[PDB]
Amino acid sequence: GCCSHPACSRRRARSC
């Protein structure tokens, strides 16, 4: 998921 993808995790921490 998004929290499995560093760029996505930093850009949208709301998904984590």
Listing DSSP states for 1-16 in one string gives -GGGSHHHHHH-GGG-
Residue pair 15/3 in contact (Cβ under 8 Å)? The answer is yes
Residue pair 9/15 in contact (Cβ under 8 Å)? The answer is yes
Q: Technique behind this structure?
A: NMR
Dist. CA 14–CA 16, nearest whole Å: 5
Residue pair 8/2 in contact (Cβ under 8 Å)? The answer is yes
Q: At CA 2, angle to CA 16 and CA 10, rounded to 5?
A: 65
Residues whose CB is less than 8 angstroms from the CB of residue 6 and which lie 6 or more positions away in sequence, other chains included: none
